Amino acid sequence: VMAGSKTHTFTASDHIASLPANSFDAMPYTFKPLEIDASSLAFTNNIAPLDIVFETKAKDGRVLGKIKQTLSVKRVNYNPEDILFLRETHSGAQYMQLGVYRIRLNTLLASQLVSRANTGIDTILTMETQRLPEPPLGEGFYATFVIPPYNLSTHGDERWFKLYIKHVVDNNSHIIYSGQLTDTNINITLFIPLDDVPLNQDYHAKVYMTFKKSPSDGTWWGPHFVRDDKGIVTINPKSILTHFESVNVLNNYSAPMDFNSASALYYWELFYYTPMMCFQRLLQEKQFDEATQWINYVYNPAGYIVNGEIAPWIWNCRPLEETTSWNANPLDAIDPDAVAQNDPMHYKIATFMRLLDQLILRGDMAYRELTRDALNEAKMWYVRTLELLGDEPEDYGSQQWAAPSLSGAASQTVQAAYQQDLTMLGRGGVSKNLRTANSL
Amino acid sequence: STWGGVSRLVYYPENYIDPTQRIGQTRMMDELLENISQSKLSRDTVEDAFKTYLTRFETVADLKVVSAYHDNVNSNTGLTWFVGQTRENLPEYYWRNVDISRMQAGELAANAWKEWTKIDTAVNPYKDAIRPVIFRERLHLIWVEKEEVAKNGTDPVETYDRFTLKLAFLRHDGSWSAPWSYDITTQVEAVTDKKPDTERLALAASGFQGEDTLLVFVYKTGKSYSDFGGSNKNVAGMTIYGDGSFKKMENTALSRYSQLKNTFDIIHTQGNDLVRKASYRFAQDFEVPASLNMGSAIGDDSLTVMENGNIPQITSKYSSDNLAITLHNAAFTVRYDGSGNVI
Amino acid sequence: DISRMQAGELAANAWKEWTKIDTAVNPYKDAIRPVIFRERLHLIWVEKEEVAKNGTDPVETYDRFTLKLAFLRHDGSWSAPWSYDITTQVEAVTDKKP
Amino acid sequence: GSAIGDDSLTVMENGNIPQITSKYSSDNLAITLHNAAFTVRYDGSGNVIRNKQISAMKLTGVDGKSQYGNAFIIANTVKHYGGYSDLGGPITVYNKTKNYIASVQGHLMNADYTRRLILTPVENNYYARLFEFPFSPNTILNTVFTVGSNKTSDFKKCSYAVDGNNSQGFQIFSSYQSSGWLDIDTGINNTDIKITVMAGSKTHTFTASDHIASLPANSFDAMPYTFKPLEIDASSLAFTNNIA
Amino acid sequence: WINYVYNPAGYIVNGEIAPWIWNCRPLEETTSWNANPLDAIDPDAVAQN
Amino acid sequence: SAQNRLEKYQQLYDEDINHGEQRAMSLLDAAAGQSLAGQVLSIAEGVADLVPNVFGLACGGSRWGAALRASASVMSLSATASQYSADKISRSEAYRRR
Amino acid sequence: SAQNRLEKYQQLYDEDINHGEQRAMSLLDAAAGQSLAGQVLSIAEGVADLVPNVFGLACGGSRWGAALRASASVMSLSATASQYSADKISRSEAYRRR
Amino acid sequence: MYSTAVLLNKISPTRDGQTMTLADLQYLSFSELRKIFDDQLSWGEARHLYHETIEQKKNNRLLEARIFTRANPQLSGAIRLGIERDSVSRSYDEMFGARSSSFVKPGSVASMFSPAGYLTELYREAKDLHFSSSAYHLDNRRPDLAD
């Protein structure tokens, strides 16, 4: 048994309960209680491992069998700042708090749906409805940070950065954002929490940024927000903002509805899945006009009329328009819906294909009548579909492919190099050997 | 063909997206689906079906979380279970769970949550003293109920309130079993000083896995709590075993669980705002699994094999600053046998 | 829709057909009326019951008045009604002669 | 609501006044508007402009980032004219404050061919060109070129942006006609962002120079403006049928 | 569903091939649980013997 | 003769579902909805019956098992509604095959 | 003409059971399950109603025949569930023969 | 509860004077991983390494699929109005040249779903089913398959 740095070996010569019969058949060995002094365990995240191995070998040195295992020992932690609790604001929003982080629990869309439901349902399924604001999550404020583009001289090699908060709840630091530096400015909007009675009178909260060249904290090296008697969070003047490009505070900003929150499933069902299902059912029964009306709540190439003018957006579904991802493990099982949820562009393509199917079905139905007017109508439908699709492309890489040997194509080195490059691209961004030298 | 289809699924999922069916479809969506399943359809019919769906959505989305329970000894891992109550004036309740371990850098992926599921077992809790728990490693609902009863054989007929603790568990197929019932009137009257209307009675439940039991505490909501037992008259205890039998806890046993007071509901000092804290699984100082199944292994040259390796009992003792672990009946069998060959 | 009045005559299409209410209403006399708050229709009424006070050697009875409020849902159904006790107010304003 | 700016360049969104309160004291009616906010974002509602020119102006320069608040020269209507194939087309924009040329493209034919931006007024004679810029990496798109001198007239008189022009002849990969010319300034003044209210015969103008809650980050992306509570003396409303 | 009883390719346990052949323990150990199988015409009784 | 047969079958195919079948399917749907509409009322009756209803110097009268009976009733209603919906869908599919 | 007939019948045979029939069978199965699910609640109501419910100086109020009524109810529920399952199986067999 | 960097340092060097990386262990099953590093890794460490490798493989697959999807020439296209070029797409195009734009028609041998890919996968996974000493080894009974 291995416990941290201590290793204890118990042999059957002295810790055996009863030596079994000496025979070629099954021989069961049982042991008296074993004592382990596990006073040297390294507890990370309030959990430490403990290793147990059963070993048995004959006089010849042959291993009759080896069994390995790891035991988990958990440390009980009932500290007040590590116990998540639920609170409800005066606006009716419920949030669950753990340490410094807060999570919205309920939703308030049902109360506001009545105004849209009083008129026709066309008022319910609009981008304006989906852009409704939400009450703030407890006590706090909003902030906007501008991260400068990556430069080797000041940032240093790897393009990764993190934003930490400090002096809230406790006096330690917790990571509130992580990301990759790029070649352009980055705009980040965040919700900074604030407790009722601040710990440090001078600065109510502190936010700082870390990268490779400066992986530390420093003194006064970041925005120090202080709240007056009546709102109005201000930045302490004696705060160095060299790392940031610009840090601003938004004193009344209310974030719109979130399509990645706890109630994301219901929002997606109400706004995307339901009209699509209704359109599919109507199309299956050859009710084309109603099907078009129902699918127009999601996509319409002619635009959408709002207040008497064409709306600037293209897709009426806000999560589709903004490409909001609400799934982190899409490949845990064979599920096309999960993959589409991870990257909602596939939903755009699916809607487009459904529209094209409806148009082609209309054209075929008109064609099957043989009347001259029916023929003209079918021609119009086909021309419209062709114009929507565009012009089809041709093969490009077929003639650029050098036929490899079967052993070469299955070589482990090639796959390892490709996977290493993909991992470096996704997680880092270092561009060593910029040209890939396509001969390899 | 099958390999091609499976591989293509990732790159081109739109070829397999069916609008009428999807893994994880909510019940109300299905109800709408059969509402529009006839052969011929009109605009009014579809609008009426959508209105019914809107009614269901309004009912579901108005839920407010009333109780929570975390199935671990610390907040780093485990699953959190929530029970919530509707807005209407009906005793309708729902439950769900989330995986808090998926948190990274503050925000949680939307797939870590679970859809609300209804409870249909005729619950009539008193105010908001209803909460979930996980004892015997399956979900349980525990609540209290109040009735008005008069003592028999008294010339001036006087009435009083009888409080009954009810516990039920969720079966395999999603149904709920009949609930066990206990009488806790004396404990409530003791901890509330016979003023249940002015004081907010509160209930907490935890699952002691080490001894395979369920601990129940009834207390009066306050700003802070002292150590249990002894002179502290504000907390009463109860212990429930596997078979359903109970046992009222005494002072010596009550003082053992004084560390659980940090998971009680309190009144916020800055502003009289009620805050609810999710209960936690109890342990003394450290949690270790009660048993460990070694498994089996194959020896060299496929000649021998070890089987039935098992440690059925593992205990821990934290004395002063030293933690000691005791393993009981560590056993395994060795047998000469090959796992399939001429040998 | 009263805004459609023109010089005293109302077009017949400005009205709406009668619709039944099925939520088990038992109002006392004629104290039932509609209202609109939270911008959806609500029905509010009062009910009277005969109740005696417990623990009194001469058993005396009195009238308990209960105010009930319900609202109309999307699909035309009526929700379960909220209930409140207004016996003291009724007795005060009526001088115990209802 | 929302609105579209001139030439389909900008757009105001999320305009909302969430709280409106009234107070009738003696014979004076006062109206208070709380948290009057709206966002302004550079974006085109569907055209070549949004696809190419806006993305061109969002690129970072060589003198150090920014490119916001500068003066730009763009084309009214630009259309594909000819070439070997119709790529995304080299769409070019001039920055007067720093004398920059920013060019964008959709795709490229093949990486082996040398590529350079070429601006000629005739599209046929290579020797009639007025601008030539070689792409420092061959397989890169959306770059800037830093002319280095005030050549606004030359850029204005040079149509036919050409993305080919090799040394083995001409080899025009793509070419776009620019037609008209427009000059724009993306800088803003805090005195020109105003809210005007008409109440009967009274007119009240509130500018962001003094009634702004917090001035947002100066960037090409979404900029949200929020206002402190605004007071209106609506004591001169003409009430007809008890509504004004 | 049939792989829970017999699988010619073996069964993966803890990431390794299990040493047993049949996943059904009574079949693997050939446990007989019927002493009077010929009292009546019943193939199941005989198989149980 | 063959032309007459073709005309008859074409007319039948074009007519498709007449009005009576539409009315029958609508009736089945309405029956399912009406059967489902009683669950909230059953729950309300169950919760209301638990309050005691006798007073004086002999109190009590609460019906202990009201809630369980209400739950059983609502589940039976759900079963009936499911049966009606199944019947309607089956009839529609039969018409399509015909 | 013969080729057209072959194509039509081949398509019909390949399609087999469409979605509506699947939905109807699933609804019948769910109805049977919901009908069966009420037996535990009926038994609980029967065992709960036996407790006396009046107090004071006139006690009693127990419903003597609660358990037998509960048993009758559960047996009726079992009969209904059996009927629903039989209907589902019959429909499936008819589809197979078709 | 572990740290991947520490475990990789324990395994390193990778026989080539380099630090072991998750890509090099794509590649082999959990049993092979436990057998090879039996002297240096315990059960929990091997399990954690296997889980991390699987997660990395899935993430790489998803990233490649997304990059290919956003660069499909077929959507050019009235839907192209709703397409945005990301920094990751630019980085991939710069690193790998014109690979992302080199689409092929179905039925060509160069396609990743063509029978060539299936055969490559079969050969890659089935090459090491027998030891090189055994006469049942694939490269021994049919030496020409490698060529």
Residue numbers in the entry:
A (entry chain D): 1518 to 1957
B (entry chain D): 1028 to 1370
C (entry chain E): 1126 to 1223
D (entry chain E): 1322 to 1565
E (entry chain C): 1811 to 1859
F (entry chain A), G (entry chain E): 2104 to 2201
H (entry chain D): 1 to 147
Q: Paper's wording?
A:
ABC toxin complexes (Tcs) are a class of α-pore forming toxins (αPFTs) that consist of three subunits capable of assembling into a single protein apparatus with the ability to shuttle and translocate toxic peptides into target cells. The two TcAs termed Xn-XptA1 and Xn-XptA2 are the targeting components of each complex and display variations in insect specificity. The TcAs are the largest subunits of the complex and contain a translocation channel with hydrophobic loops at the end allowing for membrane permeation. Upon TcA binding and an environmental pH change, the complex undergoes a conformational change into an active state in which the translocation channel is exposed and pierces the target cell membrane.
